[PDB]
Symmetry: D2
Subunit: 336 residues, 4 copies
């Protein structure tokens, strides 16, 4: 009858997914987090260092979180298999813990009663979707567990689609200058799997690997072999920027690039890709719901066939809105 | 024969304790950390965001850390009881994990072969020592497990001793404006035991409780009932400041306060308490080995009996040196 | 007929005063800033690193700034005497440049045609007002040029008034942990008048003098001789906190302190002083319009007569609102 | 007889140039800064937020700065033409104010008695030099006034020279993720010439233009038309990184790129270009004297002909050393 949602992991993305759901009239029926009891959830949801106080009412009673009079069951389970999704009637589950990334790890939600799962991160094997790029690849009958890619991939893929369809990308290399996140440390500490990520996040420009540019070639297969990249983590709490250096097949004077991006923004990618010529900086995108905001004046061309294109994203807020848009899209299609 | 040391928990304090030991010719024979293998220890020890590259040679071989040609056994045990302290011959153990604070929790080191333990933090029950204040209270025959207090207590106690002995402290209230630490978060996340400490460390002035001012009254009993305080955590990676507002028994014109602090610095507290009149700010104390640096010009008096006194400390580096000074003192006394 | 306002110096305060004036329906008829032409004023007004995009329309035409269809004359004069206030019909002028602080310096606005001047900072000699504390001391016939004090004074004075009137303040010493401002530097540079204020704002805890605590004894003369204080500047862009350590005449158990503050907040100081028991940190007060937000749980008492009281303020936003409230009050009273 | 130096503008570069000169035994005979009297110069020189306390003695007497017993005349002139260079016997002048960039502007030093001028920034017209790249283009008889380029150019040019000479650069596009500097603001303020640079430095990723990548094609003319780039300013106080995305003529497997860079570092560019494979972040280069430190593991290749190369630089310290190396080179050659 209606889209109902459950959120596993009430972190940055989990909480801002809940905000996005409220803004978009999507029913959340449960939140599970083992480290956050209902009264503490109220606090964490209401006050936000980056995105301000929640505009609305937040309370708890009866082991529930109450947002603007909508009651939300709260569970405290450490593993997906333990979560009582059947109790709240087979909701679509957002898997936002960061620790259950494979189809196998995620499927424990399905066996615990979830109708679908959207992993809020890239998956080694779940099929991957970027709204505005390949969401039509979703198959209601055969895809119980999907991935909504990364924030970075949601920024690059829409831009890469427009540039590729208009000019042809021969080859590209991406850098994202990216805000620090929850996986990083306040001071130099242990990160055995990626030593540089242990270094103090507030003190350092930190190079990091990312699969996000390659991930674009999974959602736009015709770019296979033509894109990769890396990241720098820097001392800002939110908002990131993509810097795509690409070699183009057809002549691409910069005025022609701008006309293509503007047309995409105003039409087939309205709400996903935005276009600006203002003299913006990162804080200007706090709370912006777009996946990718093309910065006309920040980019530079060496010539008509070799350009550096710049596009912003609120990696927390934009991505969280895409999770909700993907959920809603899945549901309309699952009515087939 | 000689002081030998083992370090449990190769974090900020563990690593800077090792630096301090090298600077002071103290033999470290083992480091245990379950999350840091020998080759990774080399990296973590050599490069430091706050205190620069280690000036010397750092390498590994044979499952050992080699600092300036001194070989250090590396263990990888998750619990004190598992650590083979007997293997390296009953060393004095620095317990710097932050998780083994009681006499009971710490004593597992003794049963695993440690001669003594210095907990690098306040303890609910271990006796507590501040070099320059009460280290003579140490009893070789009856104190296997001690605490070296907190960084803040090592800053306040020496100042409080001088002011109290010269003027009489009727009552005092302390604020420490304190750098963020490893227990804090890069972005708003879970801190169930102290909700405010979960809020993004780089973004916020964060009020926090601290027992450090009261802890001064344990190491200077005559101040019992006369001191307490609180903290603000702020967006700096190291160096903190004590702001002691006190009501004094005898007239204390500020010139008289300065003469007392200077005399203590030049004599009975040389190396522990320092005195400055320069126009300093926090970065000026990076790497400073003193427990407490009195800032003459930052303080203000309402009158001769009510004053606000300001004193700095490198909470990482100064404290780490005091751990080493306490170890060395214990050892000279344990020869009795 | 109506309150009309001119702003001299379209900086942090100047711009946020315009925001406050729009929010409160107060007519701004001109802005003067020699370093900001109208088109640039649109940009600076529209986008704000700390307080988000202006919610409304911002444009320029005909050498005017147009905010939500209200047209604002823009002047570009380097000195008050040069500004054509007569042209926009004798407005009340906000003097927010930071450089015209005395009666003598500010009186050039009056001779250039301003009806009144409110200096957005303490003055060596203009009379000083804190809304909710002493605004009734304003005399329409004899005070052309007034001061609205500092952000810090506006935070401390209302709290001090409540505490003094209920319990009696014997003596007090204040610290404010304060966000950096426009007078500070990005990296170590020249500050000949106050050397510490030249040191990098983002890197340091910086001790600073402030007359703000003494200024409270100007606006509450019964506190003369009983209050002073100092400041620490820290690496946050906005929001500050007052820490008042005070000896009280009547017993003041903390529960009684809280009832006094809550009753003031609900009644005679509604909108000026607020009361909270939530686990707040500084970002929680971004955009808060109160002069003072008492933090119940952050404060600490040594005993019933010696307490540390903690109160927050958005130094930029709250203060800017008080400028507008003072303008509006001056005008209703100037109708006499 | 000997190289003697005068510094105009005792800022970040000016002060660190004096540090470099002490480290390298180069005689500084005068410093001019109108905003810094001798006693204040002691303070600014002695204490440094980013590079620690000066290791040595710093004092003033007789209107002189005394660093390690070397006496330095201090002048206080607002314009080059006013400075008494003749009084200290025709020194080589470092022009580090940021405001006298042209041949015409800088030539007032020559007529005020300077033997040579090195402008510590790019010039619209002075010839430009990068040590290790084109210093041999200097002509003692015809070049009174030269430029030492920018920090960024000094990082990119040596790397570009190596890569171009080994593999051929077809085309390249550079991004530098760059620490904030003295021209930026603590909070959103006026930057009429470049609006984005006015936005709060500590809060934002800020896109900026830079001529630095083009400037490399001035110092390596064979790259004309083949290189340009842009910048992001980010919230770190010092140390920056170059990200060069380039198409190469000959196949360049990454292993071959690394051997070329290592062989340059060990040989013809010893001291200018360094090579690392450690897991470094920006603070790891504080105080590093190299112009360029190639980060082997941070770079990424799409294929053998399309690569992203990553190289670090302490924009303050490394560049300052190059000023001193250029002075010393100019002098040995001026003996002709
Ligand atoms: N923050 C961003 O910019 C962003 C953007 C896109 C994708 N992502 C991805 O979203 C996922 C979550 O990221 P985040 O930034 O919200 O991290 P976070 O640390 O803020 O979120 C983790 C939350 O999940 C909880 N949790 C941990 N283990 C759990 C378990 N076993 N069961 C239930 N809950 C558990 C934690 O309490 C925490 O509240 C990660 O894969 C991350 O890569 C993050
Ligand atoms: N950093 C300071 O300013 C400071 C000052 C005084 C006291 N302290 C105290 O020192 C203690 C350590 O603080 P820190 O700042 O070094 O924290 P940290 O996070 O830097 O140190 C923790 C280290 O111990 C390791 N560890 C965790 N659990 C372990 C276990 N079970 N067995 C062995 N090792 C384990 C972690 O890998 C980490 O390397 C804490 O009690 C802290 O309160 C810190
Ligand atoms: N920011 C705060 O937290 C705060 C709070 C309370 C009071 N104040 C006071 O408000 C005053 C302004 O503060 P701010 O933070 O907005 O500073 P700011 O530097 O942000 O604003 C100053 C503005 O004045 C302009 N200006 C400079 N000289 C001028 C002149 N001669 N004529 C006209 N305009 C000129 C500049 O262009 C700039 O836009 C200062 O006295 C400050 O002490 C600031
Ligand atoms: N900081 C870096 O990373 C860096 C690197 C390479 C080049 N540069 C260039 O070096 C030059 C100086 O840079 P900075 O970062 O040291 O700036 P800064 O602002 O730190 O130093 C400028 C100094 O010049 C002084 N000054 C101003 N006007 C003067 C005048 N008329 N006469 C004499 N002194 C005057 C100021 O008092 C200040 O001490 C600029 O051109 C800058 O582009 C900077």
């Amino acid at each position: 009858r209606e889209l109902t949602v459950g959120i596993n992991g009430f972190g940055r993305i989990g909480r801002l997914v809940l905000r996005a759901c409220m803004e978009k009239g999507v029913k959340v029926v449960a939140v599970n987090d083992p480290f956050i009891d209902p009264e503490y959830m109220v606090y964490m949801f209401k006050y936000d260092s980056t995105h301000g106080r929640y505009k609305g009412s937040v309370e708890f009673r009866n082991g529930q979180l109450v947002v603007d009079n909508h009651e939300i069951s709260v569970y405290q389970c450490k593993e997906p298999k333990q979560i009582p999704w059947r109790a709240v009637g087979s909701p679509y589950v957002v898997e936002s813990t960061g620790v259950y990334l494979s189809i196998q790890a995620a499927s424990d939600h399905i066996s615990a009663g979830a109708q679908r799962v959207v992993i809020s991160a890239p998956s080694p094997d779940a099929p991957m979707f970027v709204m505005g790029v390949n969401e039509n690849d979703y198959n209601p009958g055969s895809m119980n567990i999907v991935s909504n890619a990364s924030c970075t991939t949601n920024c690059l893929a829409p831009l890469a689609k427009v540039i590729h369809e208009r000019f042809g990308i021969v080859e590209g290399l991406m850098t994202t200058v990216h805000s620090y996140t929850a996986t990083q440390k306040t001071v130099d500490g242990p990160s055995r799997k990626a030593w540089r990520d242990g270094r103090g996040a507030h003190q350092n420009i930190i190079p990091a690997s990312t699969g996000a540019a390659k991930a674009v070639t999974k959602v736009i297969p015709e770019l296979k072999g033509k894109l990769t990249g890396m990241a720098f983590r820097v001392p800002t709490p939110d908002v990131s920027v993509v810097d795509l250096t690409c070699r183009l097949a057809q002549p691409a004077p910069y005025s022609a690039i701008k006309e293509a991006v503007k047309a995409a923004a105003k039409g087939p990618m309205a709400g996903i890709l935005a276009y600006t010529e203002d003299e913006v900086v990162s804080t200007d995108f706090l709370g912006d719901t777009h996946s990718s905001i093309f910065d006309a004046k920040a980019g530079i061309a060496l010539n008509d066939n070799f350009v550096k294109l710049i596009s912003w994203y609120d990696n927390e807020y934009g991505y969280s809105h895409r999770v909700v848009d993907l959920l809603r899209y899945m549901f309309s299609r699952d009515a087939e």
